[PDB]
Enzyme design. Sequence first.
Site, PDB file in Angstrom:
ATOM      1  N   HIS B  41      25.728 -11.208 -30.164  1.00 53.63           N
ATOM      2  CA  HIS B  41      24.947 -10.588 -29.335  1.00 53.63           C
ATOM      3  C   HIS B  41      23.716 -10.101 -30.030  1.00 53.63           C
ATOM      4  O   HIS B  41      22.830  -9.798 -29.618  1.00 53.63           O
ATOM      5  CB  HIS B  41      25.603  -9.280 -28.831  1.00 53.63           C
ATOM      6  CG  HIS B  41      26.013  -8.295 -29.751  1.00 53.63           C
ATOM      7  ND1 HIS B  41      27.039  -8.263 -30.492  1.00 53.63           N
ATOM      8  CD2 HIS B  41      25.155  -7.275 -30.300  1.00 53.63           C
ATOM      9  CE1 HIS B  41      27.000  -7.150 -31.226  1.00 53.63           C
ATOM     10  NE2 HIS B  41      25.976  -6.694 -31.100  1.00 53.63           N
ATOM     11  N   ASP B  88      32.739 -12.693 -30.057  1.00 54.27           N
ATOM     12  CA  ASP B  88      31.102 -12.259 -30.439  1.00 54.27           C
ATOM     13  C   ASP B  88      30.897 -12.468 -32.076  1.00 54.27           C
ATOM     14  O   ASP B  88      30.703 -11.800 -33.041  1.00 54.27           O
ATOM     15  CB  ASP B  88      31.204 -10.780 -30.159  1.00 54.27           C
ATOM     16  CG  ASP B  88      30.013 -10.277 -30.444  1.00 54.27           C
ATOM     17  OD1 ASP B  88      28.892 -10.680 -30.306  1.00 54.27           O
ATOM     18  OD2 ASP B  88      29.578  -8.718 -30.242  1.00 54.27           O
ATOM     19  N   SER B 173      25.929  -3.491 -35.948  1.00 52.65           N
ATOM     20  CA  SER B 173      26.338  -4.648 -35.326  1.00 52.65           C
ATOM     21  C   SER B 173      25.971  -5.951 -36.526  1.00 52.65           C
ATOM     22  O   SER B 173      25.165  -5.964 -37.090  1.00 52.65           O
ATOM     23  CB  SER B 173      25.498  -5.098 -34.239  1.00 52.65           C
ATOM     24  OG  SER B 173      26.071  -4.700 -32.873  1.00 52.65           O
ATOM     25  N   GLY B 174      27.263  -6.813 -36.481  1.00 50.42           N
ATOM     26  CA  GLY B 174      27.262  -8.091 -37.452  1.00 50.42           C
ATOM     27  C   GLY B 174      27.605  -7.604 -38.748  1.00 50.42           C
ATOM     28  O   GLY B 174      28.050  -8.737 -39.544  1.00 50.42           O
TER      29      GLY B 174
END
Lengths: 98, 218, 223
Positions: B41, B88, B173-174
């Site tokens: 995402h 994801d 995120s990530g």
Amino acid sequence: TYQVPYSINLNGTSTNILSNLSFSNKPWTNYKNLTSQIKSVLKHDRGISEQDLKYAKKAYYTVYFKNGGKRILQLNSKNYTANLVHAKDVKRIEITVK
Amino acid sequence: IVGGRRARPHAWPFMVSLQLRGGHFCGATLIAPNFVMSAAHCVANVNVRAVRVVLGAHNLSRREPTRQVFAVQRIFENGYDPVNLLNDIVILQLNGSATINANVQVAQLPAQGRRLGNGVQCLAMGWGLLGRNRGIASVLQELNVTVVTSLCRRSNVCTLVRGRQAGVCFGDSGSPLVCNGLIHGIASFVRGGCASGLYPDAFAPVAQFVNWIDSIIQ
Amino acid sequence: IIGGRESRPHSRPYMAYLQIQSPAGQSRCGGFLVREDFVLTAAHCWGSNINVTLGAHNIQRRENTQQHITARRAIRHPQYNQRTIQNDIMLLQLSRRVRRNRNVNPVALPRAQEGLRPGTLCTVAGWGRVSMRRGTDTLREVQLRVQRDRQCLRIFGSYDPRRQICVGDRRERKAAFKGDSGGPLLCNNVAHGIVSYGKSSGVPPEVFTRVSSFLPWIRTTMR
Ligand SMILES: *[C@@H]1O[C@H](CO[C@@H]2O[C@@H](C)[C@@H](O)[C@@H](O)[C@@H]2O)[C@@H](O[C@@H]2O[C@H](CO)[C@@H](O[C@@H]3O[C@H](CO)[C@@H](O)[C@H](O)[C@@H]3O)[C@H](O)[C@H]2NC(C)=O)[C@H](O)[C@H]1NC(C)=O
Ligand SMILES: *[C@@H]1O[C@H](CO[C@@H]2O[C@@H](C)[C@@H](O)[C@@H](O)[C@@H]2O)[C@@H](O[C@@H]2O[C@H](CO)[C@@H](O)[C@H](O)[C@H]2NC(C)=O)[C@H](O)[C@H]1NC(C)=O
Ligand SMILES: *[C@@H]1O[C@H](CO)[C@@H](O)[C@H](O)[C@H]1NC(C)=O
């Protein structure tokens, strides 16, 4: 200084106003803040409340990105991806309730 | 990262900052000299050609000679579902190969299919928001967390800081989740808000994609 | 304005362009001069601060015909309903009276309960978007047909023919659109309606506020 056009579609009706969300001097946002701003304009422009959304048939918004893609966010979802989003990459936001 | 602490400089030389328009927006993990691993995402809706991949960083507000910066040559996804936030994970092939040194090193991955049980002690990290009024972190932050399975889907690795309000936040995120020295998670989504104290943070479960990851980095 | 044409510059000297400040951001609407000190528009164009520009053609240009005036009062109809979009009418009292000339003068309002029979061709003008992807910097206009009430009753659940007008043939790709709110529906050089709402697609028919139904409140408010 940063602005993103949005429109509200409520029960199949949409006013003919041209409206924008301001991001002032802070172009970096996130989906928690954005969902919060979408709920505020829903309350301020069309009198739609949290309860209204809680019991709505459908309640979501679509972020259109200028590159051409889109992302759909549920107004009643408490799950938020943990990424930062730059306002200048967003083309428009369309809000749909019922 | 909310409620964390500063990492000591270059303690995690596989940690990557993804940057757009001069700003950090997501983390990543160096998994080979020319490949990083992040959340799907993070790049699903960006101009991939505009992303800068920054290796060897510690304080993003400062100029750092230890940094090596790359562009993204190609991306590889593995069935990402943005409605349900399943699978994801993305691999970004860099336009070159990193020079490996004390400040820039490749991370270690687990074996295919390995699951973590309740209570395993892990370490989250990132340059995300420090709080809902305090702003984005300049220095890499780290945070002790515990794997939990309650209020978590089986398709995620979830973690919690029990006894206080702390967790990953926007911009994390990530970023990798490190457990027993191996990258078991990629930060994916939070529930209700950052550091709720009730709902665990959700990571993409790296061990589920190891055979695919290997097929990509070859 | 969807499916219209560029207006002749200054051919509609009552037209007002509104810049609106709101909590979350900024909005744009139309409106129209009804007296030297008042602009009529839609109540959903209300905001904490409103700037009115009169005498304009290209609003993205600094034109010397333009008179910029702040609204010192923005008076929404007392029974305006944001959710159903009913009683969607607002009066703006200008902080100073306009300097009346050829490029700035008011438009007449109709008689009380004056008919607008179905089939009548009217004109609407505005600076709104011309498609779901493109806009305009200059005033545009289009001719629309008044509909029978049944055309909107089968679509819009809060449409009230006593307060509102159903406007636009579905089979014509012609409508008011985003940013045209508050502008006049002109039939015989009398402002009979106010652009209010429609379907998100822009496909007609759409709903205008019926000016004649609010004449008592308009006259009371301006007195
Ligand atoms: C918070 O987390 C740190 C780091 O966690 C460890 O490393 C991560 C990268 C992940 O792989 C995690 O799964 C892993 O648990 C913990 O640091 C560790 O603390 C222990 C002691 O509690 C250290 O072991 C000791 O080291 C000393 C030397 O200082 C020896 O004398 C001891 O005999 C013993 O071996 C361990 O080295 C240390 N690891 C690192 C990388 O620093 C920390 O304990 C934890 N804190 C809390 C309160 O949970
Ligand atoms: C690999 O790409 C890097 C990064 O390029 C920058 O980031 C991209 C997203 C895009 O915006 C590019 O236009 C940017 O230049 C290259 O690093 C740059 O290389 C040029 C020329 O060598 C150099 O002048 C710049 O200083 C470098 N910028 C940074 C931030 O380091 C790198 O050269 C590329 N390597 C190969 C082998 O192609
Ligand atoms: C109105 O104009 C004034 C002066 O030009 C400006 O300070 C203000 O921001 C404007 N307000 C709106 C709503 O456009």
